[PDB]
Amino acid sequence: FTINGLMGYYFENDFFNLNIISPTLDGNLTFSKEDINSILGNKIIKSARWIGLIKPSITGEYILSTNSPNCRVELNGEIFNLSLNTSNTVNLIQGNVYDIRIEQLMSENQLLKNYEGIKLYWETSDIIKEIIPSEVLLKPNYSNTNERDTDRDGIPDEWEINGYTVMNQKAVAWDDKFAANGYKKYVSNPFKPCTANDPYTDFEKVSGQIDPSVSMVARDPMISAYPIVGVQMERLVVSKSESTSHSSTNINTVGAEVSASANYSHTWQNTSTVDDTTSINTAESAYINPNIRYYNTGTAPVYNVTPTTTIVIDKQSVATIKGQESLIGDYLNPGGTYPIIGEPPMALNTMLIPINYNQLKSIDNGGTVMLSTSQFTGNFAKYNSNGNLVTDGNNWGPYLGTIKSTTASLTLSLPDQTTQVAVVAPNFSDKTPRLTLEQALVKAFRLEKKNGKFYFHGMEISKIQVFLDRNTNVDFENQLKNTANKDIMNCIIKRNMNILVKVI
Structure with a gap:
């Protein structure tokens, strides 16, 4: 399971305020400086906080520790880490998982492009010491709760509004520099842990923490699942x-x-x-x-x-x-x-x-x-x-x-057959976000922009026909008339917006 390990959270502010959110493969909660060549000076990561679960493979007295740097651990009842070689231990049993946590607070970032390079090992009864394998570590289920991150889903309202993209790390959206290499910007809701109205949540989706079989077009928080x-x-x-x-x-x-x-x-x-x-x-x-x-x-x-x-x-x-x-x-x-x-x-x-x-x-x-x-x-x-x-x-x-x-709604038939997809969108007649025919046709059938030119594997867009609904037809005569094609950025979409797309 690729998505197997502990979820990390890093902050440029010396006291948790967000900046980047990338998972960790296992006991090595690292973030190489070769994966931050997209962030300005603010590469010098300051603090961090890794949460998640843990399921040992045998009931034993485990000891959690790390090289150095000030850090704490919340293993269900006890605080730990820091740097000490002694510790007060902590019982863990096979078949049982335990919500974790790992605070970090380094004030002076002597390390430009700060590697942080935090390592976590655990020693049981036997003198066996080694970095926790990703076979016992597991991410924290972000699936919608039961009955500043308001919705409570691993994201900041700031990122849900102003958007947030996701490289093999996941972080806020930086217009220029980012969209350059080619990244799909994510728009989200702050009061709906799952806009697309589905089992999975915003964070779970964009990240991948979902059903491996789901269609890649179903990885956005704005595209249903x-x-x-x-x-x-x-x-x-x-x-x-x-x-x-x-x-x-x-x-x-x-x-x-x-x-x-x-x-x-x-x-x-x-x-x-x-x-x-x-x-x-x-x-x-x-x-x-x-x-x-x-x-x-x-x-x-x-x-x-x-x-x-x-x-x-x-x-x-x-x-x-x-x-x-x-x-x-x-x-x-x-x-x-x-x-x-x-x-x-x-x-x-x-x-x-x-x-x-x-x-x-x-x-x-x-x-x-x-x-x-x-x-x-x-x-x-x-x-x-x-x-x-x-x-x-x-x-x-x-x-x-x-x-x-x-x-x-939104159907197609480019690849070889038909593919129907649903696009989140409030109704005309307050928590959802604003969508248009464009951004909808960019996460519904995967059609980004190389040089600001809508394309499908190179195939032009001036090589695909249209087939909206009678309603939107006149509603397009209104939307269009008010403007003029080329923009393609005023063509908003509403609920139950029957739309099709052939191809010449």
């Missing part, structure tokens, strides 16, 4: 009721007005071409064997539940694809299929769906079989504080709710 299942068909095979195999394509819906929706679905057509060449009365039905596969265009992964799809023609339903909960070959990987292309699809009527002559004459005239996957998802991955294991919690469902109410 949910999945968006759905079901696609690959070929329908109908016959007589005691053969009509048809290969067709599927598409990702983005219904228009005359949309405050965001559920799941998949339009469908029928290749009316003659696959070779070529007896229905009226009082006859039909037997249809269709095969379909799942799709995950969300920013997260699904585990337990298997959503329920609603197949229909015109408006006349036909069958429903009830998903089997508590059973899945392999999770529904973010942007993955179930089964995967590495296996065979799953026919609704693998080895019934009826229809009447009136329906049989309406399914072939044009061609369309709607599959509107409702909105049902199983359990997700919650970081376990004690053992430090991303395990199957207890459901997803009640998570989608708050999301939509505070997040706006």
Whole structure:
């Protein structure tokens, strides 16, 4: 587990006031001077405070110590460190974890670009001395509490407002110098430990402390962390009721007005071409064997539940694809299929769906079989504080709710297929932050700026079309008219802002 060790906090002020927040791999709470070539003179780090947990591997009398520099330790009941070789010890047991802490207060920074180079060793009964391995050390769960950093989530309101970027260290946003090398600025809320309205928190996200499977686009505190299942068909095979195999394509819906929706679905057509060449009365039905596969265009992964799809023609339903909960070959990987292309699809009527002559004459005239996957998802991955294991919690469902109410839509299809994402954004009609169509299209589909030019792997942006919603269409005629394209920095977004994006 990459994210395994103790979380550190450094301050330029001799008495805790923030400056930088970077994790530590283990007992060596260092910060090489080669990782501060972005901070002005204020490299001479002054104080520090490492918090986190600890889970030994055997009940024994441990002794925490460090080379020198003034420091204290809060190992649940006792103070320690300083520099002494004696100490008063402290009992630690296997299977038990212990919230830590490590104050530091060096006044004179004789070390320019101050290495600080603080080392922490622990000696048990046996004369075995060595830096605490990252196998016993663990970071502090930042996951939203139960029922100056106001929200209480490992960040300062100053950084949540004025923003904060994150290199392999994480720190405040410094316009010029930083965005130079190419870094995504983070905007956050101070009264919502999790703006995107999700399990994970602001700090946890940007840092990475989250589900490894989540889509990189889901690493911002402004970009939700949910999945968006759905079901696609690959070929329908109908016959007589005691053969009509048809290969067709599927598409990702983005219904228009005359949309405050965001559920799941998949339009469908029928290749009316003659696959070779070529007896229905009226009082006859039909037997249809269709095969379909799942799709995950969300920013997260699904585990337990298997959503329920609603197949229909015109408006006349036909069958429903009830998903089997508590059973899945392999999770529904973010942007993955179930089964995967590495296996065979799953026919609704693998080895019934009826229809009447009136329906049989309406399914072939044009061609369309709607599959509107409702909105049902199983359990997700919650970081376990004690053992430090991303395990199957207890459901997803009640998570989608708050999301939509505070997040706006946004779909694509650049890479090779479709990718739906949600973008946090308050409503027009007070704690959230302000977002625009740009910054939203910079953390929704990863499209930064090399030289202030919006690009996608080099691919121009003057090579992608648009597909907003009727509302925003006129709301864009207002937003635009007031200004003039080029700026692209006045195109604010609101909740339920249905938006799509093709590509030429």
